[PDB]
Structures are given as structure tokens and as C-alpha cells.
A and B are shown apart, each in its own frame.
With several copies, the nearest count.
Chain A
């Protein structure tokens, strides 16, 4: 069948007038000022906006017009995007958008795949259908959210999917305009043919559209008749995908505009585990972690609404996904306080690991402290950017909300009306997470 990105509807978006449709590319950049990205998966929204931003950088490299504020996208991009109809095609003889055969369910990471189990979460590979729109917006998560496949299967342009810090706005034109910071290098984006390796530091549009995995896909003698896994009832759907591995060559000095990088060069991953081990305590979404490398290295303090995406993954297991729209105006920064804020997980685990009495090092401590940490984190984190900018919200007054749940936990823990039990309850109350300078 014939498919095209510029013609057929692919992105689910709400309207500022209040009606969510499915529209194609031409309507969403020709209107571009009455809509917002509306995806159930948050990093999926991030991938689609990344695709739009790379498209905007391509249009800026061709026609050379910047996006002015409070005004929709310039009309000089449709006579650059209208003449190429062989470009964004999926099926047929020609260049495609972005032996070994795996299930198509592993492309969309939320849907379980052929694990080492006889059963999955009520899914089964090569059986459940999936529509064109979700396949296509799952291919946008290849260059930016590709994980390790057992240390023999390579990752994307980063060894692990890094934390992504990014500016959010009420408008799609506002989203594109607020994230327009370019660099002098051009690159070679994947919607061209075979990219030229040339020298290192390949550029920006090359790394925005990097291909860690080849995708070919295959279509049998027609297909299905209704949806079985997506939810939107569509026509005859696809069956399976094809995948291979490109080993990313060594070197390739490349810094991500939205990525958060450790000082040693490795990518910074989200730090959420469902196990409270000897060194971790499950708290919440870790918006606190990726603040050192984005408020000191790239972008820094700036005006505009800030958005944070965390997709934790250990080796080849996808464990969660979330989002956080945080507040930011750009009123400078304190290095040390934001350094403490850059890892509260160590402080929270150190507070959890304290036992009722004693000095053993790997005793589990108080396990009901770990059961009140998530609500306290949710209560602290609603004005997370207010805590970030250090106006009137600090570490020393953020733990004041911890007191009530801790009083009632201490009521459970010391159920005696004695002087001694009241004293241990009060000493239990004084517990709060102490900051750490790493």
C-alpha cells in the first residue's frame, strides 16, 4: 500500500479550541498555533517534538528563516516541504523513513515482547495488530530512547538513553520557537540516503536522526480486520518487524542539546527501581537527578516552561516512564545547593537505612519509613521548580511536610503511653534527609 507522512494523518494532538483530531503534517505546520502535543506516553510526545525540531532545523538550513515569537510558523517552509513526495514514504521501492526478524511488539517498548516467559501481560507476539500511526511514532523513539539489548546488541548514539531536559510551551509554534538554539555544524539527517561517515563530530541533524537499528518491516497477504492491541479500530494491520544492529564506531565526540551528561562522559539514566536494595530506596519520579548537567552546561538558566522525561532502564528491562513540567525563569543558580539536589536518592536511602537502634550497616532499617517517602515526595514536588530556583523553598523547609506522616508512623511504631516511648517518638520525628556533597 501507499503511505506518506506529509499526506496521511499520524499525530494525535488536542486543539486549543478544544477538539483532538488526527492530522497530517501539512495541517499541523500550516496551523501550528492552535494545538498541543497530546500523547499518552510522555517520551512519545518528546520524540514527536524532536522530529518537528529536526524538521525545523532542516527548513532553516534550506530557506533561512527563524521562528519569530507570537506568530505561527513562516510560510516559507511549505514550498520546501511540498516538492518532495518520494521522501517520506514507507512501503514500496525507494528510501524509507528511518535476516534477523524480531516481533513488532518490541519496537513499541510499552508492549511486552518475546521475553523468557511462556506468557506475557496478556499479549502475544506476531498475533496482536498495531496501526500505522503507532508504528511510525515508535520509530521516532529509536534514535533517542534505544536501550542495551544484552551487551551484544548496540545502543543508540548514547550508551544508555540519557535524561532529556527540554523546554515546554502552550503552543506548538511556542514549542518550536523556544527550543531553536542551533549550532554551526550541519550534519546528515537520515531522511537522505546513506549518510557519509567522513570525519568525527558528525553534527546535529545526523545525531538527531541517528539509526542504531535498521528497520525494514514486512506485510503479508493483506492483514487483519480490527484492532487487537492498539485500541483505535483500524484496517488490516501489520504483522511483524525486521531489525538489525549497527555497531556504533568508537570515538564520535557528540553532545546532545537536550541530553544530560555525567562529568565523565557517560549518559545519565533515571534512577528508579522497584526494589529497595541496600543502596536504593524507592521514592518517586526522579526529576531531581538531571539538574547539574542542564543548569550548568547546556541552556543553563533561562525563561520558559521546562519539561523533564525519565525512562529508567537496567540492561534490557524497561521499568517505568513519567514526565514533569517544572517551573523555570532563569534567576541564576547556586552550584552547591543544586549539586545536593542533583541526587536526593542517596540522602533518602541513607534516611531509610537508619534502624530503630543499633549500628549494623546493612540492616533494612525502618521499612515503614519507605512507605511514606512517596507521598512526601509527591507533596514536595508539585512546586519542584519553586524548590529549584531557591526563592523561599529550600531543603531545610521541604522536610517540614514529612512531620505529620512521621508522627503517625511513630504512633504505630511505639504503641506505649510511657515517657520513654514518647521520647523515642520525638527522636523519630527529628529524622530528615541530610544533604550529600557528591
Chain B
């Protein structure tokens, strides 16, 4: 069973993501330029969000030996650790390795310091790395591990490192023609001089757009990679719902403090997911009445209408939700009165979706 979470976010003039040259990301959707936010940036910002700290238990590091050396007061094991890692399969200080944090910390410390071997020490270190699946951020984002076959030993093996991603974040597609804007900034030299000029004349590009943000949970995958338990799964689903509704990508927020909040949530339970990108194949051009958010919601509700009747799935109906705060932004302004449980909160929709997940409550699950 899999969960869809859709947002429609309007943002202040901001640069939440850039390419190598510094331009905001763009995609050619529907024959026109649409502003794009990378999925990996959203996944990272939700990973580092201030509510995931009880569940943030994954580390993506190449400085594993530094992590070992930090938790050792007087027993310097950093060359022995380095050669153990270098014959583990990583060849250099290494490549990027994904694992649980505290597990690798304590038990790699105990399995590395003992002077019992050098080959089987690397083998058991690699096994500890490969068995590090007790973390739900690894379960959501996904992780493989490929060591080298040259700088290794013939007696060192690797178990199956198969971890499937339980989350498919889409790239935030703008609901209109992208208007990329050019920002011209100077850098003031604090001390004066003859020239009366700037320390650094620079280039920055910003884009103000209404982004269609789209995520999707594979809850069945989320528990097939997080073992038999469901408490941690429900806690992670609630944590993501809070984080995504509450945090923003940590791009140039110090220069563009665009911390605006999602003006739309659409949660629909089914076994065949859908993005409402085709709701905005026609670019949204505003009219004198209403605003960009309302016109985008109107086109989205039109699409929800002809995919709830033309593409109707009444074997598994929509449990389509909203976050319409005290009904500020209704969906069905003309015909689409199919929003079964339109609410105006966030913890209520969290509790509701974990209720259709199973017999859970918001406060009891928030302890794992």
C-alpha cells in the first residue's frame, strides 16, 4: 500500500537550487520552460529538518576512520583503521559510504581496536557496514554499496547490499512559464579607497514561482526494508509529513528568506499513483480576479474531476485531503465536491493517514 502527498507551494523570490553555473533549474515540460527544484535537495532538506532529529540516523561519509578516531580518548587507531578500510574494498580518503551512525560508531569502535587480526578485521568491518540497515532514512532514500575489485583481498567478500528506496520525490515543476530573473549584486569594501567601487561585482539568478511539489511513500516498501515493525514506519511517515509541511530547502535562504508554506495538500490512497503535472500542461496565466494559487488550484481540481470520473477508480476511491485552513482556499469552487475530508490542520491529516494505515495514534507512535 502506497501513499501520495502532493503540494502546491508559491514561493517568494528565491534561489533554492542552482546548477554549476548558478542558474535555477529548468525543465521543458509541455513545450515551455518550467522552473524546477531538484528532488535530491528536497530529500536532503527533509532529512536535515528540525523534526527528523529523533529519526535522523544515517551517515554518508568517506571519513569513516575519522569517526572511529573521534571516539577514542587515548587509543590512536587511524592508520590501522585506514588500512583496514583500504582493504575493505574502498581504495584511497575513500568513496561515499551510507550506514547508521551510532551503530557504526560504537560497534565499529569495539570491532576495530582489538589486536586479533587485520584481514578478518576488514571482513567483519565490511559485514558491519553491510548489515547497517537499522535506520529509516536509509530505508527511505535507498543505498547500494560497490567496493573496488582491484584494491582488495581475494579472501574478503561482500554481502548483498540491496536496499530499495521507499520514497519517490518528484522535481517541483512550476505551474506556469518560468520567468528566470537576473539579480545584480555588488560587494562593499568596508574600508574606503580612491576608487569608490565594489569588492566583488557578482552574478546571482533567482526565480519566483508556484511550484507543484510531489512526493510518494511506498509504505509496503517502507516496512519491507524496516523489518517487521510498523511503529517506526508510522513515526517516519508522520515525521516526513511534519517536515515537508514545515521545512524548506536550505539554498540561498540567508539571502532570500523564502520560508513560505505549502498552500495545498492532496493525500490520496490507491495502488496506482498520479502526479498532477498534466493539470498544468496548459500554463496557468492569471486573470484580474483571483490569484496564481487559486487558478492553479482550479486547474488542479478540474484535472482531479476528469481523473475521478473519466479515470475513475471507484474500486479504490480517493481519500483526497486538503490543508484548507478554516476553508480559506476551497477546491470545488464550481463542481468538484469530491474532497471527502477537507480539514484545516496538519496534525489531523497526519493522524488520519496513519489511521487508514492502521490502528495508530499521533502521540503514542511519537516515541520510537
Contacts and interface: CB of A to CB of B under 8 A. Distances in A.
B32 A276 contact: no
B130 interface: no
A411 B32 contact: yes
Nearest to A276: B20
A75 interface: no
Contact of A363 (B32, B33, B203): B203
A370 B203 CA distance: 18
Nearest to A355: B203
Interface string A262-283: 0000000000000110000000
Contacts of A367: 19-23, 205
Interface in B217-247: none
B331 to A, nearest CB: 28
A248 B168 CA distance: 53
Contacts of A408: 28, 31-33
Interface string A406-419: 00110111010000
A412 B33 contact: yes
A50 B356 CA distance: 65
Contacts, number: 45
B26 interface: yes
B33 A411 contact: yes
Contacts of B31: 408
Interface stretch (B110-118, B149-157, B173-181, B261-269): B173-181
A144 to B, nearest CB: 32
Given A363-B203, A412-B33, A371 B26 contact: yes
A367 B26 CA distance: 10
A368 interface: yes
Contacts of A370: 20-21
Contacts of A409: 33
B21 A276 contact: yes
B281 interface: no
B54 interface: no
B contact patch SS: loop
A368 B33 contact: yes
Interface string B1-33: 000000000000000000111110010100111
A214 B138 CA distance: 47
B206 to A, nearest CB: 13
B203 A368 contact: no
Nearest to B31: A408
Given A356-B182, A363-B203, A368-B180, A412 B26 contact: yes
Contacts of B34: 412
A contact patch SS: loop
Contacts of A363: 203
A367 B32 CA distance: 17
A207 interface: no
B20 A412 contact: no
A336 B32 CA distance: 38
Interface residues of B, number: 18
B20 A275 contact: yes
A365 B19 CA distance: 13
Interface string B150-193: 00000000000000000000000000011110100000000000
A276 B203 CA distance: 17
Nearest to B202: A363
B178 A412 contact: yes
Of listed A356, A370, A413, residue having the most chain B CB within 10 A: A413
A275 to B, nearest CB: 6
Given A363-B203, A368-B33, A408-B33, A415 B20 contact: no
A364 B21 contact: yes
A408 B27 CA distance: 12
A248 B22 CA distance: 44
A415 B209 CA distance: 13
A415 B21 contact: no
A415 B28 contact: yes
Of listed A356, A411, A412, residue having the most chain B CB within 10 A: A412
Interface string A355-383: 01010000111011011000000000000
A365 B23 CA distance: 10
A276 B20 CA distance: 7
B21 A412 contact: no
Interface in A327-359: 356, 358
Contacts of A368: 23, 26, 33, 180
B45 to A, nearest CB: 22
Interface string A236-276: 00000000000000000000000000000000000000011
Contacts of A412: 26, 32-34, 177-180
Interface string A394-426: 000000000000001101110100000000000
A412 B29 CA distance: 12
Nearest to B19: A367
A404 to B, nearest CB: 10
A371 B19 CA distance: 10
Contacts of A275: 20
A248 to B, nearest CB: 31
Nearest to A282: B20
Interface of B: 19-23, 26, 28, 31-34, 177-180, 182, 203, 205
Interface of A: 275-276, 356, 358, 363-365, 367-368, 370-371, 408-409, 411-413, 415
18 contacts: A358-B20, A363-B203, A364-B21, A364-B22, A364-B23, A367-B21, A367-B22, A368-B33, A370-B21, A371-B26, A408-B31, A408-B33, A409-B33, A411-B33, A411-B177, A412-B178, A412-B179, A415-B179
Given A368-B33, A370-B20, 18 more contacts: A275-B20, A276-B20, A276-B21, A356-B182, A358-B20, A364-B21, A367-B19, A367-B20, A367-B21, A368-B180, A370-B21, A371-B19, A408-B33, A411-B32, A411-B177, A412-B33, A412-B179, A415-B179
Closest 9 CB pairs of A and B: A412-B33, A367-B23, A367-B21, A364-B21, A412-B178, A276-B20, A415-B179, A408-B33, A412-B177
